Design a protein around this nucleic acid. Structure first.
Length: 179
RNA sequence: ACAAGUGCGUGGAGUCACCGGGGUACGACCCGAAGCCGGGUGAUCUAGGCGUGGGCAGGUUGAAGCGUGGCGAAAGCUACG
């Protein structure tokens, strides 16, 4: 690190050619890639930043893969543009947030996005802006989702989904409603 | 029960007493436990429930809430009271 700094600074000050070192430490192999012979491996960053996939817990659900991470992040970015305040949600398929909603009590918003896309949908990445509740949990029942992101969850809700479903990659992100 | 043998019985001595021994049942030569069961007694102690009262020197710590002030484009972060 020390030396890297000594490089970046000097290359930007003394001379002009600037050098950007990257922040990709602690690795983890995933399933594979777009195809079975396309092995991808997530490399977390040591940076303490804030809302990021690095700091998310897979309560239950088979190991997330390439596409998973990708879309999940796109979703996160979508919900994070609206900056707290008004309740909001989102969804996404093949790197395409195809279902943003705001509204009041999530319920409506959530389903309104499901109306937005009632085709492809099945197997998207719901990205709510706060905790999920049974109201719409029963709406989600049958409507296959790949991953469900959320700042936090409610015990009964969490349990409910957990046992009922057998695929939802529940990946609520501890404290994402900040900078 | 057919027979043959055999068992028991048969040519009159028992019965009623008094004084004794002994067996058996009853407390049974005397004393010696824990226990079992019937009907009554007890919550002045102690355990718990309830009603209605009494009490806890003097200090310490300093949650939420509230006021003012900082740092911030906001998001938000933060000091003291």
């Amino acid at each position: 690190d020390y030396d890297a700094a000594i490089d970046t600074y000097l290359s930007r000050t003394l001379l002009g050619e600037e050098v950007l070192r990257l922040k990709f430490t602690d690795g983890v192999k995933l399933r594979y890639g777009e195809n079975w012979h396309q092995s991808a491996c997530f490399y977390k960053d040591p940076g303490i930043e804030g809302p990021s996939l690095a700091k998310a817990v897979q309560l239950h659900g088979k190991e997330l893969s390439y596409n998973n991470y990708v879309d999940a992040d796109n979703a996160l970015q979508t919900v994070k543009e609206l900056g707290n305040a008004s309740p909001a949600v989102a969804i996404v398929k093949h790197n395409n947030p195809c279902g943003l909603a705001t509204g009041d009590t999530l319920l409506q918003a959530l389903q309104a996005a499901w109306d937005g896309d009632p085709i492809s949908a099945y197997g998207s990445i719901i990205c709510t802006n706060e905790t999920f509740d049974l109201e719409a949990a029963t709406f989600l029942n049958g409507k296959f989702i790949e991953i469900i992101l959320a700042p936090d969850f409610k015990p009964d809700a969490l349990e409910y989904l957990k046992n009922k479903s057998e695929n939802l990659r529940l990946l609520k992100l501890p404290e994402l409603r900040e900078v």
